[PDB]
C-alpha cells in the first residue's frame, strides 16, 4: 500500500535533496511530508537489519527516530522501481530558518540563543545515535512556530558517525570547514562545530560570513551587525581554523553566552506569537 493511506498535496521543497510534497495521512488526518528520492541520484547506500539495502538517509533517520522532537521524524518509507518515498512528520505552522531570517533579518541574541541551543541539542542527539548530519545550515532547520521548537531535517548528505577521517563531502560548501577546502579531509565533530559557527553567525548577522573558498581558508570574521562582545567570541571559537582549537559541544553550551536560554514555548510567545 502507498497511494491508499496518504493524500498527496502541493510541492513544498525541491530538488537536489529530492522533491518534497505536502501530504496528509488518511488514517488520522496527520499532516506529513512526502519526500521522493530518485535511485539514480543516491550516492550512499546502507544495509538494514532486514539485510535489505536502502538509501543512507533512511538508515540515519531510523537511528535518530524516537521521542525526541529536535530531529525530524521518519514515519515510514516505501521502495519504488526507480525511486524511494520517505514519509516524514510535518509541523504546522512551520517555516525554515532561512525564510524566517530572510524576512526578519538578523535575529536578536535572546532568540538566536534559544534557536542555536536547540540545534546544539539536536546535533548532540544525532551524534549519540551514531549519526553525523554533515549539512547543518539554516535551510535544513525547521521552526515549529507554535511550540517554538526547531527540527533538524534532511540527512541526505549525512553519514554514520566515525572517529576516523572523512574524505567525502556532499554538503553545502559555504558551510564546510577550511580543512575540507584545503585538504579534502576532516573529522565529523570538528567540522560540525565549524558549520554551527557559520549558523550562529548567520542568525546574529542575518547572513553567512564566508562567500568564497579564500575567505573560508583565511577564516577572518568581520561583523556587519552589532553583536554582543561575547557572542562574537563563541562564533570565532567555532570558526577556529585549526580543528583542534574548535570548541566541543560541551564547551559551547558551557560558554557564557549560552546561559539562561529560553524554553521553547517562551521563545514562541516572546518572538513568534
Ligand atoms: N528536503 C527535506 N529532507 C528531509 C525532510 C524535509 C521536510 C520534512 C517535513 C517538512 N515540513 O515542512 C517542510 C518545509 C516547509 C516549507 C519549506 Cl519552504 C521547506 C520545507 C518540510 C521538509 N525536507
List C-alpha distances in Å: 11 to 169, 185, 234: 28, 36, 38
Question: CA–CA separation, 121 vs 105, rounded Å?
Answer: 24
3-state secondary structure of 227: coil
Question: CA–CA separation, 83 vs 189, rounded Å?
Answer: 31
Measured from the Cα of 89, ligand 1's closest atom is: 9
SS (H, E, C) 7-60: EEEEEEECCCCCEEEEEEECCCCEEEEEEEEECCCCCCEEECCCCCEEEHHHHH
Catalytic residue selected from 44, 135, 202, 207 = 135
Residue 164 near residue 66 (C-beta atoms within 8 A): no
CA 140 to centroid of ligand 1, rounded, Å: 8
Torsion sign, CA atoms 97, 98, 101, 106: positive
Indicate whether 236 and 217 sit together in one domain. Answer: yes
Torsion sign, CA atoms 123, 238, 106, 99: negative
Indicate whether 86 and 219 sit together in one domain. Answer: no
Resolution in A: 2.8
CA 166 to centroid of ligand 1, rounded, Å: 27
Give me the DSSP letters along 93-139. SEEEHHHHHHHH-SPPHHHHHHHHHHHHHHHHHHHHTTEE----SGG
Residue written as cell 533579518? 105
Tell which residue, 126, 258, 252, has the closest CA to residue 194: 252
Range of the domain at 29: 1-92
Indicate whether 135 and 191 sit together in one domain. Answer: yes
Ligand 1 contacts CB of residue 34 (under 6 A): no
Ligand 1 contacts CB of residue 72 (under 6 A): yes
Indicate whether 102 and 224 sit together in one domain. Answer: yes
* Best residue for ligand 1 mutational test, from 24, 95, 140, 142 (most atoms within 8 Å of Cβ): 142
Is residue 235 packed enough to be buried (19+ CB in 10 Å), middle (13-18) or exposed (0-12)? buried
Indicate whether 88 and 98 sit together in one domain. Answer: no
Residue 85 near residue 77 (C-beta atoms within 8 A): yes
Ligand 1 contacts CB of residue 154 (under 6 A): yes
**Which CATH number belongs to the domain containing residue 46 in this structure?**
3.30.200.20
Experimental technique of record: X-ray
Tell which residue, 41, 37, 40, has the closest CA to residue 58: 37
Indicate whether 61 and 125 sit together in one domain. Answer: no
Indicate whether 124 and 87 sit together in one domain. Answer: no
Indicate whether 51 and 119 sit together in one domain. Answer: no
Task: Among 92, 115, 143, identify where a domain stops.
Answer: 92
3-state secondary structure of 75: strand
Half-sphere exposure of 18 (CA within 13 A, CB side): 25
Residue written as cell 535544513? 140
End-to-end CA distance of the chain: 40
CA 20 to centroid of ligand 1, rounded, Å: 7
**Which CATH number belongs to the domain containing residue 171 in this structure?**
1.10.510.10
Question: CA–CA separation, 75 vs 67, rounded Å?
Answer: 12
Indicate whether 125 and 259 sit together in one domain. Answer: yes
Measured by CA distance, the residue closest to atom 10 of ligand 1 is: 90
Which residues sit in the known binding site for ATP?
A: 12-20, 35, 89, 96
List C-alpha distances in Å: 146 to 6, 103, 137, 149, 267: 24, 18, 22, 8, 10
Provide the β-strand partners of residue 186: 166
Query: Other CB atoms closer than 10 Å to residue 271's CB: what's the count?
Result: 18
Provide the β-strand partners of residue 74: 88
How many domains in the chain? 2
Sheet of strand 74-79: strand arrangement: 6-13, 19-25, 30-38, 83-89, 74-79
Which residues sit in the known binding site?
A: 12-20, 35, 89, 96
Indicate whether 85 and 111 sit together in one domain. Answer: no
Indicate whether 155 and 238 sit together in one domain. Answer: yes
Indicate whether 234 and 214 sit together in one domain. Answer: yes
Residues in CB range of 136: below 8 A, 6 or more apart: 119, 123, 152, 175, 192, 195, 196, 199
Measured in whole angstroms, how far is the alpha carbon of residue 77 from the centre of its chain?
Answer: 20
The reply to whether 28 belongs to the active site is no
Task: Among 68, 92, 116, identify where a domain stops.
Answer: 92
Task: Among 92, 109, 125, identify where a domain stops.
Answer: 92
Residue 221 near residue 239 (C-beta atoms within 8 A): yes
CA 96 to centroid of ligand 1, rounded, Å: 8
Amino acid at each position: 500500500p502507498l497511494e491508499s493511506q496518504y493524500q498527496v498535496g502541493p510541492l513544498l521543497g525541491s530538488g537536489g535533496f529530492g522533491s518534497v510534497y505536502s501530504g496528509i495521512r488518511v488514517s488520522d488526518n496527520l499532516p506529513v511530508a512526502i519526500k521522493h528520492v530518485e535511485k539514480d541520484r543516491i550516492s550512499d547506500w546502507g544495509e538494514l537489519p532486514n539485510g535489505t539495502r536502502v538509501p543512507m538517509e533512511v538508515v540515519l533517520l531510523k537511528k535518530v527516530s524516537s521521542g525526541f522532537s529536535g530531529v525530524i521524524r521518519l514515519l515510514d518509507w516505501f521502495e519504488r522501481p526507480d525511486s524511494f518515498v520517505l514519509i516524514l512528520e510535518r509541523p504546522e505552522p512551520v517555516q525554515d530558518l532561512f525564510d524566517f531570517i530572510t524576512e526578519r533579518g538578523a535575529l536578536q541574541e535572546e532568540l538566536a540563543r534559544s534557536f542555536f541551543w536547540q540545534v546544539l541539542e539536536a546535533v548532540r542527539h544525532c551524534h549519540n545515535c551514531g549519526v553525523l548530519h554533515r549539512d547543518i545550515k539554516d535551510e535544513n532547520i525547521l521552526i515549529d512556530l507554535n511550540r517554538g521548537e526547531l527540527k533538524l531535517i534532511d540527512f541526505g548528505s549525512g553519514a554514520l558517525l566515525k572517529d576516523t577521517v572523512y574524505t567525502d563531502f556532499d554538503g553545502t560548501r559555504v558551510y564546510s570547514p577550511p580543512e575540507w577546502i584545503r585538504y579534502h579531509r576532516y573529522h565529523g565533530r570538528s567540522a560540525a562545530v565549524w558549520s554551527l559557527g557559520i549558523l550562529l553567525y548567520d542568525m546574529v548577522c542575518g547572513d553567512i560570513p564566508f562567500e568564497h573558498d579564500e575567505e573560508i581558508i583565511r577564516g577572518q570574521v568581520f561583523f556587519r551587525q552589532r553583536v554582543s562582545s561575547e557572542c562574537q567570541h563563541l562564533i570565532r571559537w567555532c570558526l577556529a581554523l585549526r580543528p583542534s582549537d574548535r570548541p566541543t559541544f560541551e564547551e559551547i553550551q558551557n560558554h557564557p553566552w549560552m546561559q539562561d536560554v529560553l524554553l521553547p514555548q517562551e521563545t514562541a510567545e516572546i518572538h513568534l506569537h
